[PDB]
Amino acid sequence: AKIIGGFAVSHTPTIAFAHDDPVWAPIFQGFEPVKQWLAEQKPDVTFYVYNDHMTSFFEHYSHFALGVGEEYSPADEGGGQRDLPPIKGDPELAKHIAECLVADEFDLAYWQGMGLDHGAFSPLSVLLPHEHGWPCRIVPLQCGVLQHPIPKARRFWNFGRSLRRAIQSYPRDIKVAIAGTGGLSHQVHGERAGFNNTEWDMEFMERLANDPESLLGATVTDLAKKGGWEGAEVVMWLLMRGALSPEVKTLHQSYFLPSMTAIATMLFEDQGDAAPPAESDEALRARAKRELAGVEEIEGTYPFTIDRAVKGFRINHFLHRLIEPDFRKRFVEDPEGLFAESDLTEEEKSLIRNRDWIGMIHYGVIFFMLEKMAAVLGIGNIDVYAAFRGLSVPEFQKTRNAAITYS
Amino acid sequence: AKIIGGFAVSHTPTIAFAHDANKYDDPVWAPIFQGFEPVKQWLAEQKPDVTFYVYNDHMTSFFEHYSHFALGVGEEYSPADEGGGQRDLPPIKGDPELAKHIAECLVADEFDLAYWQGMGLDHGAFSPLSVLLPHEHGWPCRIVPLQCGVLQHPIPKARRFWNFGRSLRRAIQSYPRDIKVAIAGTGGLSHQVHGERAGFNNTEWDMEFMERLANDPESLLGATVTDLAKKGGWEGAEVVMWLLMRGALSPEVKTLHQSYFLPSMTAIATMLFEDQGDAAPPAESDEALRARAKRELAGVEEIEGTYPFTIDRAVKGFRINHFLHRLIEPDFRKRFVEDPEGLFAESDLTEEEKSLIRNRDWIGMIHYGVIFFMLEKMAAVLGIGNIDVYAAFRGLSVPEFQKTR
Ligand SMILES: O=C(O)c1cc(O)c(O)c(O)c1
Ligand SMILES: [Fe+3]
Ligand SMILES: [Fe+3]
């Protein structure tokens, strides 16, 4: 129901690709006030805010890729699956966060089942215990910051500001953290690969808290030379900061600089809003539900919302692969062999095996994978439609005007 | 820079299937084509350089990562496999240059996007196009595909679509090169293709929606997702793409054409709008908006050894980045080490790009168009560490560079 505090933090895989020495030991002295903070707060969920580094987000690269999944494994980065356990996500808040962001005219993406890169699991292994599982659940906000144009900082900030109200409006009884993992100043590409600027580094750290609203004019240029090209990924801080309350109590403000990348921490504490906001919680939970309000009156109709997508993922994903000429070769030639290898539940295997079109719709299969399945089996859309209507094809064709078939 | 007009058409796979099975001749299907014919001819008469082309992918190229406004920035686009193999249609050229500039302007107008290359276009794009353009060995124009996530709710309010379109018009007019741009919105009208309600139509509503959209579009801007789905079937709610398109056209338009046919499940509809234009003068000027865009990368040229990753860059390096990207697939990277040559010969990579990989040529790759994180992968694959590549970026040696702090 409300947010408690939030941490900024470098995400360099130097933390990963080595640790899991006394040059490092009084830098974990920076990682202590965060690690301590995440055990004597006990967070239900962390709205994690990182950038994928061309690992899971390449060919399709978006600005705000909201993870909505059940859970997240580590991404193979060519250097191997990093030996860590899946961390659980929160579909139920993610759905709610999305609805509010949408009504406030923001533009999102939804993903699931894609591994996490160094932008996440590297500094997130060092800030949490990972024994046989993970302390808590995550809500990952992947940010497109490597392909320009990217959202303006003014924009990034407001997204936080919208998130602020959005999470605060989630009716359920929970306390939520925010991870805005970015930076700090550096550049890892080209001839000028090396530049740092700790005097910008310092002024930045300070200005984030004490006067953030004035940063909202910093062009991509204004963080390019100032703090290296990649170092500009700091816009992910302005959003974390955005959500967190106007005023904050900087429970720790560390900084060193070992290798390639400046490494810094900025844990704050949430207080509360600097005023009761121009729109109530009642006014924002109801509105977030405006576009689909009363859609449950509309019969024989199974809207594809985030909750349905999560339920339908394994099976949606499974029939998705009918696009692949091999997978669809195996699907016709050796379904059982194929299922035996899948991660589908027995009911999921049954729905497919029995060819229960209406069931899959009841279950959460979006029509469009049923479409491909039909095609693969050398059978048309009409068949699937008639099945939906408990009719025989010729009976359904009675309802049409013309009697065409196609796939 | 000249927006000639915009058209609206259904994108049912039944169109494609009628085109492919040459039912052009067939009494059921014949009149439906006579219906496309006036749009076809205008397209052939006006000869637009680029069609900015709005459509929804049908859980094909967008499934696991599903954005709302997915601009297509690529060199060219092919037909997606939809379970039965790619259609017989050559690729269609895109417009990277235009895509970039549009991207700049919408970004400034506080719209969040997505950029993509390489993936197939499904019946959303190719069903209608294959009947409106001659494709008997190229396509007469170029496309800027905009894929809209209208399938997985929450999706943007109908108003955001119109607003995207308005912002798009100026984004296109403000394009400072002299080309003819048509605009396309695809999908609907009434149809529902799922659940027990499937087979639902409403001609009365289709004919209303079409006329409002042509004559009083702002009337439709408060219509909710529940409203549109009750009226035109759940999937007919995709018509929010007709707004977007209509948004980008002159406030008043001249409707040259309309047709309607309901043979099966989908109201197969067509609209052709002649852009009137700046009958009213631009609320904000070309120069000032053009400036509001390039703005964020203002003066960024004057930073040395810094090759930033703009759309034009991602386009240039796509083949090599995609190739390097694939290092995360284990079967591939274990072949990169044992059988590098066999892999290059399998790949569509150029002979330049190839040599750049062989030569473990760190800085020319950054130069060419590769983003670092592709190399950061690549390095870790051959057992070489990160800090080496930085040494080579500086033209220095392993220990020589390690000096700073
Ligand atoms: O069954 C149909 O006519 C149909 C199928 C689709 O997959 C679709 O996107 C559409 O607009 C219509
Ligand atoms: Fe990063
Ligand atoms: Fe569609």
Residue numbers in the entry:
A (entry chain A): 2 to 21, 27 to 413
B (entry chain B): 2 to 406
Give verbatim excerpts from the published study on this entry.
SYK-6. On the other hand, DesB exhibits not only a strict substrate specificity but also high enzyme activity for gallate. While LigAB is an α2β2-type tetramer, DesB is a β2-type homo-dimer. In this study, we analyzed the mechanism of the substrate recognition of DesB on the basis of the crystal structures of reaction intermediates.
Interestingly, a large shift of the Fe (II) ion was observed in the DesB-gallate complex. The shift of the Fe (II) ion, which seems to be critical to the catalytic reaction, is likely to be induced by the substrate binding at the productive binding site and to cause the strict substrate specificity of DesB. On the other hand, the Fe (II) ion at the A-site is located at a distance of approximately 2 Å from the R-site and coordinates OH and OH of gallate. The crystallographic analysis in this study showed alternative conformations of the Fe (II) ion, R- and A-sites, both in C2221 and P21 crystals. Analysis of the van der Waals surface around the active site showed that direct coordination between the hydroxyl groups of gallate and the Fe (II) ion at the R-site cannot be allowed due to steric hindrance. For the direct coordination, the Fe (II) ion should be shifted as observed in the DesB-gallate complex. We therefore concluded that the shift of the Fe (II) ion from the R- to A-sites is required for direct coordination between the Fe (II) ion and the substrate. In addition, the catalytic reaction of DesB requires the shift of the Fe (II) ion, leading to the bidentate coordination of the substrate to the Fe (II) ion.
